[PDB]
Amino acid sequence: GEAVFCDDMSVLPGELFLAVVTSSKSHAKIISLDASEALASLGVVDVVT
């Protein structure tokens, strides 16, 4: 367990963790994209589009 893979690296002060929301539809226009709840959620720093 001494082999450091990618995730095994220490977290740096300030290092952030990423999660992505994906299309639940096969082929579709995107009428509305509201993330207002997200940005406010606990310990979120930014939503990127």
Partner: protein
Amino acid sequence: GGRHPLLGKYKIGFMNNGKIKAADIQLYINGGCTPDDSELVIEYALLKLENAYKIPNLRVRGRVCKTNLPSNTAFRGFGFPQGAFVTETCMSAVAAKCRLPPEKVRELNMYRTIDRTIHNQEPTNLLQCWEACVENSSYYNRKKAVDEFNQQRFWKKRGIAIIPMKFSVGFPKTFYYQAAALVQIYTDGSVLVAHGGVELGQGINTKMIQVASRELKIPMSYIHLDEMSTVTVPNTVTTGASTGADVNGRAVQNACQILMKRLEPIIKQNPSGTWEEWVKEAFVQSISLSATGYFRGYQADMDWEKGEGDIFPYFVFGAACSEVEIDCLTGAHKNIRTDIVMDGSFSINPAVDIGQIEGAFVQGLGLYTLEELKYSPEGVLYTRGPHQYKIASVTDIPEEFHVSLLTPTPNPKAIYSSKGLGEAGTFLGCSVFFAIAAAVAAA
């Protein structure tokens, strides 16, 4: 995404003795919603689907039909396990219609003399692997026991299958083959290697050390490798097409040679000294101990309009004989024995390569027997995870698994007459498929 599903449409004109005279085969593959490596897949599946067989009159067409599914990309075998499987579905189909034995129909249409691929590129120890496989497996003896078993058993049946294989390796353009290295020698005698390949578990890093050990003639332990980085080797190419260590092997070899030649005068004034004394004196005498290597790549080119060209530097020949027992009542089956002969030709690391074959064989196995992806009418992925996506476990692989490399043989093109076996094993899994297929028939 993953490997490209593939629908095959074929017409086989054959003679009554099994020899196939003509084949008009048509391939399509679901590429998903973006190009990615798709187009190169269908190019490749087409080039290689002929496999080990000379069909004197053969037309094959293929197009990448795109859909609203996630974007598909490369996968061990890159189009060959997909396209080859269709041509094998003809040899057993024809053998069926004839009522002739499968391996009989297979060694009728298999290459004999020096010949040419469907793209006009041009010896053959393919037969050797086949022959050796026919022996090491005792194919004819066991097929007998199988036949008997089928006469004793009704609600249960067995099947045995032996499949030939002519695979090949490498990208379809010269510049895709280039590779680099930067080898460093510090004044304490320790060496730091660094190249363009990337360790994925197939042991590139290990090999480059083996190489560095030859050309510097110091023990592997003097040599060390940190990582791959764009700081040390600029403008590199993906680690793929089973050529990883062929190309980098050459780059690293080039770096070592260049260096050694620089220590030439140093190993003359003290011809019996130690590697350590040499380097210290190199430094004191202003000889540079920083050197970079490079490999322009193997000449390869293809012209799709004329439909002919020389792409692959060499070929990998192999074959496998697998055997199974299916439970006619539930559909389940167990893999009993499997034998594999594969032309490795002076492997650079017998333990590494053998591992490649063993592994790649199982991925092959899962593709044809166990692994399933399923989508709803509107193309949403049902099977998301291990709980629903079943890869082979310890109890799925043939409990008697033998692998053997053909006696070493010249392949002067590649470094040290080696041969990249990375993707090789995959196609040979369909031996378990056609092992199963014959059980069903007998049922």
